[PDB]
Amino acid sequence: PLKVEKFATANRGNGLRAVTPLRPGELLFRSDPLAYTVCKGSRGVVCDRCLLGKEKLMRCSQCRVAKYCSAKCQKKAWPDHKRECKCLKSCKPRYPPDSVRLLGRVVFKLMDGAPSESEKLYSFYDLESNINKLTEDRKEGLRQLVMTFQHFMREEIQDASQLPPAFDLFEAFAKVICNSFTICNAEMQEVGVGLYPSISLLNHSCDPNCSIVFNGPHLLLRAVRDIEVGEELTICYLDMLMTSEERRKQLRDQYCFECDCFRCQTQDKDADMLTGDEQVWKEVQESLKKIEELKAHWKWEQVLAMCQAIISSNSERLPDINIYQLKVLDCAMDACINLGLLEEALFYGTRTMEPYRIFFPGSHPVRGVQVMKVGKLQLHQGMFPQAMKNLRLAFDIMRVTHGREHSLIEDLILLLEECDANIRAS
Ligand SMILES: C[S@+](CC[C@H](N)C(=O)[O-])C[C@H]1O[C@@H](n2cnc3c(N)ncnc32)[C@H](O)[C@@H]1O
Ligand SMILES: N#Cc1cccc(O)c1
Ligand SMILES: [Zn+2]
Ligand SMILES: [Zn+2]
Ligand SMILES: [Zn+2]
């Protein structure tokens, strides 16, 4: 018996609403993707199948593009990789955009696979395309994606008989633009992109009552507020560390809608987000383009060097609640963790705690994970009371946002037991 149902909203298309009253942390839906792939930066860093990092990956001998953590993952991926393999090989030096690789996997799944549980509430066929809102500039981009698909897939798809009935590639890419999910690993690093058509029923809110989290390719949808029967379920499509102007741009450009919510009408938190000297944070925002590029390719040493040049600059500095400063601190802490510089990681991480408390209100998985990471750093430096407080806080959040079905919660419980044991040993 489902706790959610599809319905026709008054002014934002189809949506999902509660069938029964829901409490924070209640599991509402879970789904594997219809189709997913590793993203450009994590290609060859994480396993194509399970999206976990490993020191060495095994490559597919035939295409040498797909890479895997284990023989089990390589073999189990074979059915869904078989047809793209021939295409990735035939186009050997060229690598397609992620959306093109994703849509290839959609087509093969729809042509060769049994009906997917991911489409139980809503199918790829049903997805919103927003075609009558696309700008001419966007349409031109989609035409180029279509031609890119036709080139990449030419070994496996020659005509319409090899596409689902009445399948339109331009419409399909339009659906991909406004319905793709960015898959994050346990550490909240972006590692892949997928389609989850049932989950695509959820409309957006800048102050949502539900949240999604990924455990490998697997998606869990949870309530993060009390929700009444009949109330619409929402998730935030966007990074919380964004101004209302930045949210406006991305919701127009990617999703073709204007947000009417209280936060957007009042520029909620914008002023605090942009405190400090404008010329400094405009420079930091510009530098974050390359820092975030380097991070997406797991280039931690280079990330750290650019972040240290800002955090410990000889020139003017920003407050930690400035969102561009905060992003830099977070990149620096993740780089330090991955480099084993744990004292320095804790320094940056602790500095993010109060800004994260402000910018991730309620129960948000990004804050839960950040608090977990800080507590773990404190635990292994022997700061047991402080670690315990943060690990408990991480559990208060993550019991709502991750829940027992998520493997990270088991890791957190272990840290809680370890820290508690240390406190009892006195
Ligand atoms: C396809 S998904 C969500 C489900 C969608 N309403 C549908 O009918 O399939 C994303 C799209 O939903 C719409 N949408 C999502 N959140 C919205 C919001 N807060 N206000 C208006 N439209 C929204 C926009 O068309 C957006 O591109
Ligand atoms: N290859 C390729 C390609 C096709 C469309 C857009 C783009 O950025 C790249
Ligand atoms: Zn694997
Ligand atoms: Zn291959
Ligand atoms: Zn809004």
Residue numbers in the entry: 3 to 428
Sentences from the paper on this structure:
The drug target in this study is the epigenetic regulator SET (suppressor of variegation, enhancer of zeste, trithorax) and MYND (myeloid-Nervy-DEAF1) domain-containing protein 3 (SMYD3). This belongs to the SMYD family which consists of five proteins (SMYD1 to SMYD5) that have similar structures and domain compositions. The SMYD family plays an intrinsic role in both normal and diseased states, with overexpression of SMYD2 found in cancerous tumours specifically oesophageal, bladder, and stomach whilst SMYD3 overexpression is detected in liver, colon, and breast carcinomas.
Screening was done in parallel against SMYD3 alone or SMYD3 with the active site blocked by a tight binding inhibitor. In total, 20 fragments were selected as hits, of which half apparently targeted the active site and half targeted other sites. Four of the hits were successfully identified in crystal structures with SMYD3; the others did not show any electron densities for ligands in the crystals. Fragment FL01507 is considered the least reliable starting point for generation of new ligands, since the associated electron density was not as clear and the binding site had not been predicted.
